[PDB]
Amino acid sequence: SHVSAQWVAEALRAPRAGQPLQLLDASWYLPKLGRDARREFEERHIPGAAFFDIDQCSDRTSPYDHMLPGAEHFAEYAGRLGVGAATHVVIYDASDQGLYSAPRVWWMFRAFGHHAVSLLDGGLRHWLRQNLPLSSGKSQPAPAEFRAQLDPAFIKTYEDIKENLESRRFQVVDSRATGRFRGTEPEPRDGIEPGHIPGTVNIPFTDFLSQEGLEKSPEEIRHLFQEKKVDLSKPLVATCGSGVTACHVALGAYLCGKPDVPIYDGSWVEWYMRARPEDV
């Protein structure tokens, strides 16, 4: 479920009984962009939206940022943002690319057992170009009761990726920019070198998106995967810098008929730290 701006605009005008919408802004940026996602939500957001913060809704113990939270934590947090069992969640972000971190939160809702979840195609960027209405300020919806349960099949761990270098049970696509993957541009985290996990295929997340910031068609995405030597009939896992834009690979495959693309949540930052490549 990709929904258009026009879909969301009508959903706002015309709710349907017993099945409320909750818009979430899940904007998140690497530090080097200098953006503050939460302050930007307060400057502007789509009316009714709440801010979903991927760095707060995450594992409380791990030293890695935005690792999947426990189910109880996820349910508490989503509930406090006004998402209940009956809620159709629609997620966007305000990225320059159209959607950047929203797919991650779409993927998290699915992983915790909530399938009534969609993505606003083109995000706030497209919304703004359409001259659609904005609100501002902090936005606190009525608390709701949410039940969550993690399906572990949505996740791959370091060990899984490590053992897969031998067994090759699944294909692995990395959605980072070509420069970071190939090791010719820096990783934007302190201490981490660029490069890639051996045997992975680079499909920058930007390849799934138009010039205008809109998701490509299912057939275009199909051909993208073909041109990259990835076979959608065999198992497929996605990885990136830190488990965020890898969810674009999961989304692209989903829209092609493949809903089972687990994410290496730890991603390059974990791989670099544990595997300690000396390559680059």
Q: Which of 57, 240, 247, 256 is catalytic?
A: 240
What are the C-alpha distances in Å from 256 to residues 89, 109, 231, 238, 270? 21, 20, 12, 15, 29
247 has catalytic annotation: no
Q: Are 23 and 49 in contact (CB under 8 A)?
A: yes
Burial of 227 (0-12, 13-18, 19+ CB in 10 A): exposed
Return binding residues for substrate: 180
Residues ≥6 apart with Cβ < 8 Å to 223 = none
Cα separation of 182 and 180, whole Å?
6
Strands 155-156 and 263-264: parallel
**Strand runs (DSSP E) across the chain, as ranges?**
2-3, 21-25, 50-51, 88-92, 117-120, 155-156, 171-174, 201-202, 236-239, 263-264
Return binding residues: 180
Cα separation of 250 and 246, whole Å?
7
Q: Hey, which residues are catalytic here?
A: 240
